[PDB]
Write an enzyme that holds these catalytic residues in place. Structure first.
Site, PDB file in Angstrom:
ATOM      1  N   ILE A 199       1.026  -1.281  -0.254  1.00 36.54           N
ATOM      2  CA  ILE A 199       0.150   0.086  -0.098  1.00 36.54           C
ATOM      3  C   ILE A 199       0.540   1.174  -0.228  1.00 36.54           C
ATOM      4  O   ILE A 199       0.660   2.651  -0.433  1.00 36.54           O
ATOM      5  CB  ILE A 199      -0.976  -0.002   0.969  1.00 36.54           C
ATOM      6  CG1 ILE A 199      -2.323  -1.019   0.502  1.00 36.54           C
ATOM      7  CG2 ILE A 199      -1.524   1.415   1.351  1.00 36.54           C
ATOM      8  CD1 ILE A 199      -3.359  -1.454   2.471  1.00 36.54           C
ATOM      9  N   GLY A 200       2.287   1.490   0.156  1.00 36.67           N
ATOM     10  CA  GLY A 200       2.884   2.796   0.160  1.00 36.67           C
ATOM     11  C   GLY A 200       4.391   1.706   0.151  1.00 36.67           C
ATOM     12  O   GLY A 200       4.760   1.151   1.209  1.00 36.67           O
ATOM     13  N   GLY A 213       7.379   3.675   2.593  1.00 37.65           N
ATOM     14  CA  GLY A 213       9.223   4.659   3.071  1.00 37.65           C
ATOM     15  C   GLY A 213       9.991   4.256   2.838  1.00 37.65           C
ATOM     16  O   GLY A 213      10.857   3.539   1.703  1.00 37.65           O
ATOM     17  N   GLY A 214      11.170   4.913   2.956  1.00 37.92           N
ATOM     18  CA  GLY A 214      12.527   5.558   3.169  1.00 37.92           C
ATOM     19  C   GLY A 214      12.945   4.905   4.436  1.00 37.92           C
ATOM     20  O   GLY A 214      14.563   4.092   3.018  1.00 37.92           O
ATOM     21  N   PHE A 215      12.427   3.931   5.010  1.00 41.93           N
ATOM     22  CA  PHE A 215      13.641   2.491   5.280  1.00 41.93           C
ATOM     23  C   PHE A 215      13.125   1.505   4.731  1.00 41.93           C
ATOM     24  O   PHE A 215      13.496   0.128   5.291  1.00 41.93           O
ATOM     25  CB  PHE A 215      13.700   2.808   6.956  1.00 41.93           C
ATOM     26  CG  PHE A 215      13.862   4.586   7.738  1.00 41.93           C
ATOM     27  CD1 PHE A 215      14.610   5.315   7.109  1.00 41.93           C
ATOM     28  CD2 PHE A 215      13.218   4.917   8.100  1.00 41.93           C
ATOM     29  CE1 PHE A 215      15.650   5.862   7.607  1.00 41.93           C
ATOM     30  CE2 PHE A 215      13.397   6.069   8.890  1.00 41.93           C
ATOM     31  CZ  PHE A 215      14.985   6.907   8.910  1.00 41.93           C
ATOM     32  N   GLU A 226       8.364  -0.856   3.535  1.00 37.95           N
ATOM     33  CA  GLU A 226       7.276  -0.165   2.246  1.00 37.95           C
ATOM     34  C   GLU A 226       6.232  -0.722   3.986  1.00 37.95           C
ATOM     35  O   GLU A 226       6.250  -1.342   5.506  1.00 37.95           O
ATOM     36  CB  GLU A 226       7.389  -1.376   2.250  1.00 37.95           C
ATOM     37  CG  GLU A 226       8.612  -3.534   2.849  1.00 37.95           C
ATOM     38  CD  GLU A 226       9.409  -2.896   2.848  1.00 37.95           C
ATOM     39  OE1 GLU A 226      10.507  -3.717   3.983  1.00 37.95           O
ATOM     40  OE2 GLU A 226       9.737  -2.319   1.447  1.00 37.95           O
ATOM     41  N   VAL A 227       4.990  -0.413   2.938  1.00 38.11           N
ATOM     42  CA  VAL A 227       3.500  -0.454   4.005  1.00 38.11           C
ATOM     43  C   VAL A 227       2.271  -1.536   3.628  1.00 38.11           C
ATOM     44  O   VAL A 227       1.681  -0.809   2.645  1.00 38.11           O
ATOM     45  CB  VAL A 227       3.169   0.985   4.103  1.00 38.11           C
ATOM     46  CG1 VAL A 227       2.591   0.823   5.386  1.00 38.11           C
ATOM     47  CG2 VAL A 227       4.208   1.600   4.717  1.00 38.11           C
ATOM     48  N   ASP A 236       5.640  18.192  10.485  1.00 35.56           N
ATOM     49  CA  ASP A 236       5.823  18.023   8.993  1.00 35.56           C
ATOM     50  C   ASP A 236       4.607  18.081   8.865  1.00 35.56           C
ATOM     51  O   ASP A 236       4.401  17.046   7.563  1.00 35.56           O
ATOM     52  CB  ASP A 236       5.872  17.199   9.188  1.00 35.56           C
ATOM     53  CG  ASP A 236       7.027  16.658   7.972  1.00 35.56           C
ATOM     54  OD1 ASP A 236       7.044  16.894   7.036  1.00 35.56           O
ATOM     55  OD2 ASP A 236       6.868  15.562   7.388  1.00 35.56           O
TER      56      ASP A 236
END
EC number: 2.7.11.15
Lengths: 339, 614, 61
Positions: free
Chosen positions: B169-170, B172-174, B176-177, B289
């Site tokens: 579903i996504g 990230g930088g470190f 995954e989702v 943020d």
């Protein structure tokens, strides 16, 4: 001060006592008995092992039919047994784990125990409604029950670590008579046959003789150099025995008002835990923290026999009313009967 | 299997003690947990006569709070007065005070009916339920059941095997989702995993740490407008976070496909965001943020604030650093050495909103990595505004975007309430925003190194959020499992009654604690701890062996094949080992066993007949 | 401990005012008890196993 004008008076009355006694002491029992035949070898054998408790047994007591016997244990349980068969009559879960003594009413109807709950619990064994239920809890002591014995279904005597004994009226639930005098934990007691007197022994290394009816102490015997753990009356009631941490037993006489004898050996070093006499009084049985139980010639002080059977302290023991046999309890958890 | 299973009822003996030691057996601590409440009220409704009219009254007040309009409130407050006040009061059955009855009657006769009209009656109800009523609850099957569940709660150890995975579903930088499902219950969930090798490489350990610290401050109180966390756990290689699921992409990706939004359409995202902000600021977290890309959409088009990596606990030490995205940071944030609070988000929120409307940050005039000219159009340009804009919209943006903190919306006054009172949002009913009843403008379419001085930087990182787990259970398996395990238990009680029940062995004695454990020689026995001994048995028989407190030299806790176990040193050199079904149980057997033996040995040394001699 | 040392005195007042007996009379008296009752004491004077419940008795009423 006034206290040392009376403590010095305590020293000059103690000595008038130390006087009347040394003047009674013409001969010694071991000299008067020197002539009679030795008792021979008493090599009794284990005849029943009673298995049931899950840890140390601390006390036990024959019912007056020399068949049934109550024991108490570290396992917070009280067993009553039936020695002739080995069957259990009652297992009695206790309210307090910490029991230490137990007792059988002569009538059969009740037993009693207590321990560090400082209570003496009577139990009904013929409950109208065919059951075993607590029927009284005797609170009043400010220390641990260490021993007790009924006089009938309505009276009982207790000894406590508070340093006192008392007689109870079980209906009343309150001390009908109290017994002060001891300067340390009372550890055992024996009613005499008349159940008019009774003797106590305690950690002050003194035994005391009490009038049940009056409440007063009549005579105080000393000599042991250490806690008196147990005590037993001689059958005619004119004399009695004790057991102590000093590694000895002694027999005292009431009318002579002093110590008659000493039973000991240079090999026996651990303390006695229990004592009791054969039906004639000729033998003195004695338990020992060394897993053994010694049989003595009460009159000649020779060791007649040994009952080696437990793998731990012989905590307790006791001869039958009809003289037929001897029970012993122990830390190894097993009771053993011998004949 | 995967399915939930409650401990047998005998678990109470150990749980009631664990709870009692930590002060958790009180009206307040139980009544305010979702599962305590449910059990408390079943007990009050089905099993106590005196208590129903108070819980019924409780639950009816509670509905009354959640009504939306004065019209409805008026009528339903008259029904409550007539029934719970006047009916009881005419039947000699009203437990409440002479002043209680007049607070209500005084506002009701003047037709003023706020949602908090009944608050005095709440408190008085609890006084009425906090005492005898509560103690009869403790004495009951329902508290027992509370223990059965609570044991399950405090014995949570999550892995990857505890979820069915579905789809990505996504990224990230470190890491995954994935999207996913707890087999337990079925709860639909989302899972964020973070590679520890990549973190340690990128030096986002501070950042990873922060997110989790921050998700646990923000995740109490079912909050619609934030992605919150129910769990967290670790494996040798990956950190999971289990978060509310959201499939519908970000507003940075919907500004990508749809184009700028209408003033009426940002008005919906703004309302949602601002309640998300209110949440963080009641709990002393500045988000920092805030941007479109950090706003995710569910399947119906509602939004929630997303990454917490960069948020901040200002409750104690106010932050003074530059933190966030360069187009949306307030003049306090940019100033080197200058304290700020939740005022940083309100300037950011005016900045992100202006973007949705016009397509860029207010201070971004198409410079790319030149963050410098963004940060000086912020500190000197009073951002010029299009004529396109409404005067209602023009003054919210002027409000929110004053450089100096003295002046801006949300700051000197009453925090988020000032923003909600702006003329731009005059149409809204914030209650109805909160209940997510406004209709959304966009309904989404169909789609090398590893150390052990680095693995300690992750102990005291697994976490379970009681409030969230109890919500999950309550809405999925709770009723069918309470009906289930009732049936087992009455069928066991039917079975034991045909053979000859134990009139349980633990009663009437001085037994301290009892309960299943397993031992060596495993063997799974039922133990009974007493002041002077520990006793055990197999099913069917009575205790036939044991161990005394005298003989225990020591109780420690030793690891045996990845398991928390009790080491029991004994007099002869002899070792005994135990193992329990659940952490709470371990902790309480170790505790009660050490008090029991130390205290036994203190007693015995004092008794001449029982102490051992030469 | 004052009113209390007083007790210890008037209690020894008791103990010392008894009529005693000679150890020799005391020992003879025991010694004749054992003698008179030794025929009965089974731990000294065995009975038939016929009658000993811990050896060969079979019927018990």
């Amino acid at each position: 001060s006034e206290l040392d004008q009376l403590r010095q008076e305590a020293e000059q009355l103690k000595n008038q006592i130390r006087d009347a006694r040394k003047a009674c002491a013409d001969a010694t029992l071991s000299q008067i008995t020197n002539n009679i035949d030795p008792v021979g070898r008493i090599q009794m054998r284990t005849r029943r092992t009673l298995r049931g408790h899950l840890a140390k047994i601390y006390a036990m007591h024959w019912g007056t039919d020399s068949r049934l016997l109550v024991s108490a244990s570290q396992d917070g349980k009280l067993i009553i047994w039936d020695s002739y068969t080995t069957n259990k009559v009652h297992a009695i879960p206790l309210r307090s784990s910490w029991v230490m003594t137990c007792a059988y009413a002569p009538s059969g109807n009740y037993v009693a125990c207590g321990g560090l709950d400082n209570i003496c619990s009577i139990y009904n064994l013929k409950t109208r409604e065919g059951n075993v239920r607590v029927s009284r809890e005797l609170a009043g002591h400010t220390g641990y029950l260490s021993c007790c014995r009924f006089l009938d279904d309505n009276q009982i005597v207790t000894s406590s670590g508070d340093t006192t004994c008392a007689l109870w009226d079980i209906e009343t639930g309150q001390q009908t008579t109290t017994f002060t005098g001891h300067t340390g934990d009372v550890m055992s007691l024996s009613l005499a046959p008349d159940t008019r007197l009774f003797v106590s022994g305690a950690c002050d290394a003194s035994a005391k003789l009490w009038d049940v009816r009056e409440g007063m102490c009549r005579q105080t015997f000393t000599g042991h150099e250490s806690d008196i753990n147990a005590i037993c009356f001689f059958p005619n009631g004119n004399a009695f025995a004790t057991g102590s941490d000093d590694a000895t037993c002694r027999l005292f006489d009431l009318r002579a008002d002093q110590e008659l004898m000493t039973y000991s050996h240079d090999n026996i070093i651990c303390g006695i835990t229990s004592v009791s006499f054969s039906k004639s009084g000729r033998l003195l049985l004695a338990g020992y923290d060394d897993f053994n139980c010694n049989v003595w010639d009460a009159l000649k002080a020779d060791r007649a026999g040994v009952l080696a059977g437990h793998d731990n302290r012989v905590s307790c023991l006791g001869v039958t009313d009809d003289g037929m046999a001897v029970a012993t309890g122990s830390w190894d958890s097993f009771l053993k009967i011998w004949n | 299997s995967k399915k939930i299973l409650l401990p047998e009822p005998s678990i109470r003996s150990v749980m009631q003690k664990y709870l009692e030691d930590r002060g958790e057996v009180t009206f307040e601590k139980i009544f305010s947990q979702k599962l305590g409440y449910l059990l408390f009220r079943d007990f009050c409704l089905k099993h106590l006569e005196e208590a129903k009219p108070l819980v019924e009254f409780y639950e009816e007040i509670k509905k009354y709070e959640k009504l939306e309009t004065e019209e409805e409130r008026l009528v339903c407050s008259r029904e409550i007065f007539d029934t719970y006040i006047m009916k009881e009061l005419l039947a000699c059955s009203h437990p409440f005070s002479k002043s209680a009855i007049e607070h209500v009657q005084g506002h009701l006769v003047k037709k003023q009916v706020p949602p908090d009209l009944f608050q005095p009656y709440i408190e008085e109800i609890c006084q009425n339920l906090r005492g005898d009523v509560f103690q009869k609850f403790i004495e009951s099957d329902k508290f027992t059941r509370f223990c059965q569940w609570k044991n399950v709660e405090l014995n949570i150890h999550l892995t990857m095997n505890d979820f069915s995975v579905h789809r990505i579903i996504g990224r990230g930088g470190f890491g995954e989702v994935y999207g996913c499902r707890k087999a337990d219950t079925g709860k639909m969930y989302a899972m964020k995993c973070l590679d520890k090798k990549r973190i340690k490489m990128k030096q986002g350990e501070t950042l990873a740490l922060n997110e989790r610290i921050m998700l646990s401050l923000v995740s109490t109180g079912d909050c619609p407008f934030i992605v919150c966390m129910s769990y967290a756990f670790h494996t040798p290689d990956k950190l999971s976070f289990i978060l509310d699921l959201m499939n519908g992409g970000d507003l940075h990706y919907h500004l990508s496909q749809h184009g700028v939004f209408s003033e009426a359409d940002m008005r919906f995202y703004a309302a949602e965001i601002i309640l998300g902000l209110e949440h963080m600021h009641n709990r002393f977290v500045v988000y920092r943020d805030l941007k479109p890309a950090n706003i995710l959409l569910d399947e119906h088009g509602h939004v929630r604030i997303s990454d917490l990596g960069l948020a901040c606990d200002f409750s104690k030490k106010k932050p003074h650093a530059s933190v966030g995205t360069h187009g949306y940071m307030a003049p306090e944030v940019l100033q080197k050495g200058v304290a700020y609070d939740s005022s940083a988000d309100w300037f950011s929120l005016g900045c992100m909103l202006f973007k949705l409307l016009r397509g860029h940050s207010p201070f971004r005039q198409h410079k790319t990595k030149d963050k410098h000219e963004i940060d000086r159009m912020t500190l000197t340009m009073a951002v010029e505004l299009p004529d396109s804009f409404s005067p209602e919209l023009r003054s919210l943006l002027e409000g929110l975007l004053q450089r100096d903190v003295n002046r801006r919306l949300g700051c000197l006054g009453r925090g988020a309430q000032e923003v909600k009172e702006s003329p731009f949002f005059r149409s809204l009913d914030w209650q109805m925003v909160f209940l997510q009843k406004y209709p959304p403008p966009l309904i989404p379419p169909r789609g090398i190194k590893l150390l052990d001085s680095d693995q300690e930087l992750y102990r005291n990182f697994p976490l379970t959020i009681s409030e969230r787990w109890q919500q999950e259970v309550a809405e999925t398996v709770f009723d069918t499992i309470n009906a289930e395990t009732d049936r087992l238990e009455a069928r066991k009680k039917t079975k034991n009654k045909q053979l000859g029940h134990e009139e349980d062995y633990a009663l009437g004695k001085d037994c301290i604690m009892h309960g299943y454990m397993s031992k060596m020689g495993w063997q799974r026995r039922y133990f009974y701890l007493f002041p002077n001994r520990l006793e055990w048995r197999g099913e069917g028989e009575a205790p036939q062996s044991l161990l005394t407190m005298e003989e225990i030299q020591s109780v420690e806790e030793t690891q045996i094949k990845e398991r928390k176990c009790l080491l029991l040193k004994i007099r002869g050199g002899k070792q005994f080992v135990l193992q329990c079904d659940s952490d709470p149980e371990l902790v309480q057997w170790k505790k009660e066993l050490r008090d029991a033996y130390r205290e036994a040995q203190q007693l015995v040394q004092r008794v001449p007949k029982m102490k051992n001699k030469p | 401990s004052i009113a209390q040392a007083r007790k210890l005195v008037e209690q020894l007042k008791m103990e010392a005012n008894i009529d005693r007996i000679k150890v020799s009379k005391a020992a003879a008296d025991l010694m004749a008890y054992c003698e008179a009752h030794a025929k009965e004491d089974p731990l000294l004077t065995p009975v038939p196993a016929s009658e000993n419940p811990f050896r060969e008795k079979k019927f018990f009423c």
